[PDB]
Design a protein around this motif. Structure first.
Motif, short mmCIF file in Angstrom:
data_model
loop_
_atom_site.label_atom_id
_atom_site.label_comp_id
_atom_site.label_asym_id
_atom_site.label_seq_id
_atom_site.Cartn_x
_atom_site.Cartn_y
_atom_site.Cartn_z
N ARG A 1 96.77 68.62 -15.07
CA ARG A 1 97.56 69.65 -14.33
C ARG A 1 97.97 69.09 -12.97
NH1 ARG A 1 92.27 72.56 -12.40
NH2 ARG A 1 92.87 74.39 -13.65
N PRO A 2 99.12 69.55 -12.43
CA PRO A 2 99.54 69.02 -11.14
C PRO A 2 98.50 69.25 -10.06
CG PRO A 2 101.32 70.29 -12.15
CD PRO A 2 100.07 70.55 -12.95
N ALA A 3 98.39 68.30 -9.13
CA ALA A 3 97.45 68.41 -8.02
C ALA A 3 97.75 69.59 -7.09
CB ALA A 3 97.40 67.13 -7.23
N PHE A 4 99.01 70.05 -7.02
CA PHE A 4 99.31 71.20 -6.16
C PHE A 4 98.60 72.47 -6.62
CE2 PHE A 4 103.17 71.55 -8.95
CZ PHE A 4 102.98 72.86 -9.41
N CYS A 5 98.14 72.49 -7.87
CA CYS A 5 97.36 73.63 -8.40
C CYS A 5 96.05 73.86 -7.64
CB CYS A 5 97.06 73.43 -9.88
SG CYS A 5 98.54 73.36 -10.86
N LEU A 6 95.61 72.82 -6.93
CA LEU A 6 94.39 72.85 -6.13
C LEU A 6 94.63 73.25 -4.66
CD1 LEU A 6 92.54 69.64 -7.43
CD2 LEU A 6 92.75 71.88 -8.50
N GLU A 7 95.89 73.42 -4.27
CA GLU A 7 96.23 73.88 -2.92
C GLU A 7 95.91 75.35 -2.71
OE1 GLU A 7 100.22 70.98 -2.51
OE2 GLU A 7 100.42 73.17 -2.28
N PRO A 8 95.44 75.69 -1.51
CA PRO A 8 95.32 77.11 -1.17
C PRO A 8 96.71 77.71 -1.10
CG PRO A 8 94.22 75.70 0.44
CD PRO A 8 95.05 74.81 -0.39
N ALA A 48 102.28 85.73 -12.68
CA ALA A 48 101.03 85.14 -13.11
C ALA A 48 101.31 84.16 -14.23
CB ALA A 48 100.03 86.23 -13.60
N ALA A 49 102.22 84.53 -15.15
CA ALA A 49 102.62 83.66 -16.26
C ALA A 49 103.19 82.33 -15.79
CB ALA A 49 103.61 84.36 -17.18
N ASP A 50 104.00 82.36 -14.74
CA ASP A 50 104.56 81.11 -14.18
C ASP A 50 103.48 80.23 -13.58
OD1 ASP A 50 107.11 81.77 -14.97
OD2 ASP A 50 107.86 82.22 -12.95
N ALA A 51 102.50 80.85 -12.91
CA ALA A 51 101.39 80.10 -12.31
C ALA A 51 100.54 79.44 -13.40
CB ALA A 51 100.54 81.01 -11.43
N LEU A 52 100.28 80.15 -14.49
CA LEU A 52 99.56 79.55 -15.61
C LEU A 52 100.38 78.49 -16.37
CD1 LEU A 52 97.63 82.70 -16.90
CD2 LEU A 52 96.83 80.89 -15.31
N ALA A 53 101.69 78.68 -16.48
CA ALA A 53 102.52 77.69 -17.16
C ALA A 53 102.39 76.34 -16.47
CB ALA A 53 103.98 78.11 -17.20
N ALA A 54 102.27 76.38 -15.14
CA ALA A 54 102.11 75.17 -14.34
C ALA A 54 100.67 74.63 -14.29
CB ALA A 54 102.64 75.41 -12.92
N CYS A 55 99.69 75.53 -14.17
CA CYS A 55 98.35 75.17 -13.74
C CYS A 55 97.18 75.43 -14.70
CB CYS A 55 98.06 75.87 -12.42
SG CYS A 55 99.11 75.33 -11.06
N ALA A 56 97.44 76.10 -15.83
CA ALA A 56 96.37 76.51 -16.75
C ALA A 56 95.65 75.31 -17.35
CB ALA A 56 96.90 77.43 -17.85
#
Length: 56
Positions: A1-8, A48-56
């Protein structure tokens, strides 16, 4: 998953109050925050769906 998923989530300096989603990696789940409308970072989604599409 992209590292930006770990950003606050970054509300930023702006005066808008826009409901956005971020992936909370500590929780392992999409959550809401209030974005100020200027200078968005990458962990900042329309839904929420967009956030999971990127980061799930």
């Amino acid at each position: 998953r992209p590292a930006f998923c770990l950003e606050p989530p970054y509300a930023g300096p702006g005066k808008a109050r826009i409901i956005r989603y971020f992936y909370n990696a500590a929780a392992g789940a999409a959550q809401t925050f209030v974005y100020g409308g200027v200078r968005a970072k990458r962990n900042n989604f329309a839904s929420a769906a967009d956030a999971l599409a990127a980061c799930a």
